[PDB]
Amino acid sequence: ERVFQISFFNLPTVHRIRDIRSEKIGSLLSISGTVTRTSEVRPELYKASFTCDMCRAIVDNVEQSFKYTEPTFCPNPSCENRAFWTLNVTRSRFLDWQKVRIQENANEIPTGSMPRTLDVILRGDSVERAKPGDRCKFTGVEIVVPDVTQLGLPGVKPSSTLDTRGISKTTEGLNSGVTGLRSLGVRDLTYKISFLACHVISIGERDQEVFLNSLS
Amino acid sequence: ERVFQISFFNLPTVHRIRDIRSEKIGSLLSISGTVTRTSEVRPELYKASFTCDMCRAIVDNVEQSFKYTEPTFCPNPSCENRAFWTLNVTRSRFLDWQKVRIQENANEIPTGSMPRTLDVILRGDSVERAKPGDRCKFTGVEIVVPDVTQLGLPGVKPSSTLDTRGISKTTEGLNSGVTGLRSLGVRDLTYKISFLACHVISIGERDQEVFLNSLS
Ligand SMILES: [Zn+2]
Ligand SMILES: [Zn+2]
């Protein structure tokens, strides 16, 4: 089946990057900004499929939110199993994924200002439609992204937040992190605001036979 | 559904009680003898139905051979459960059951003999068709019946072969009992020969309107 997408446009009012508050999280918005960095078109895991190690039973359509999620309770028999699955990478569905960095326009920047930034996520057919240096108007939903490293990623590769640079001492303990959840353990979960975009617009052949076709 | 029965008769040769050997176990035979005792028509459990204590899931059609058998693996993988079921006596199917004791005929008995005996099982529609003192010809299958008391009956009522009389010392250790099975444990299982019968035959109103109906 074709994973469908719905693209909204022509919203009444447009927002700037400095109007982004947490009270619009989950709402449909439109924003404007200048693109300054784009990444590769990576494949994102959409509908996962696994096989039980012992039964060989097949599970399909396991939704994933922000981290690699395997199924829990086994399928149709008596077999008891909490883990040890094998992803069937061939059966699983994937999608295109891209991350772009944008900053404020030259006019919205005050007289003395260090420009604010944001992370916009393009997915599906909207990849590569924003090029660095251009001025583009995005529209989508404002979301919040947690730190998955302290959410217990399967591999040892995360290695509990390995770092190369020193974090800010000013916001050490000032950034309010929630605790209590069993998956976290004694850890503290943190959040940051990002944007997810569904529609992108920009606001800033010598063959005779094919040429005659286009014109009215 | 009607639990059906098949009744065979008119076999070529008939056997006496003293021709019963273990090498015909499972075969279709016909025997003759004089009935000397009959029991009540008790209900036998045919198709059992249970409900899981926690899930409340319903299992049905659990076959039983010679002892009260509950299911093992649950209907749903989720809840794990090896025991603690509740028989749904209303949903279960039952059948009629009767045990009759027979002995050898007056002619087949030698000049000096203590008559041999046998246990014949009548089931279904064949109950009460054999009356004590009569001479009847049975036909069915020769089976073997184990001792269920040492097969781990659920209740404490069996109390590991409670007895009121003293067993034979002559056959103490002489009766060959098999061991090794995990259900038995270190116990020894014993067998005895009985007969299961499917067809029985015997070989030894002042109302005018209804009377006129029967005659040709
Ligand atoms: Zn399994
Ligand atoms: Zn259950």
Short mmCIF file of C-alpha atoms and ligand atoms in Angstrom, two decimals, chain A residues 52 55 74-75 79, ligand 1:
data_model
loop_
_atom_site.label_atom_id
_atom_site.label_comp_id
_atom_site.label_asym_id
_atom_site.label_seq_id
_atom_site.Cartn_x
_atom_site.Cartn_y
_atom_site.Cartn_z
CA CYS A 52 10.53 -14.78 17.01
CA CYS A 55 8.71 -20.00 17.21
CA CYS A 74 4.68 -13.14 21.45
CA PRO A 75 2.10 -13.92 18.76
CA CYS A 79 5.79 -19.57 23.52
ZN ZN C 1 7.62 -17.30 20.21
#
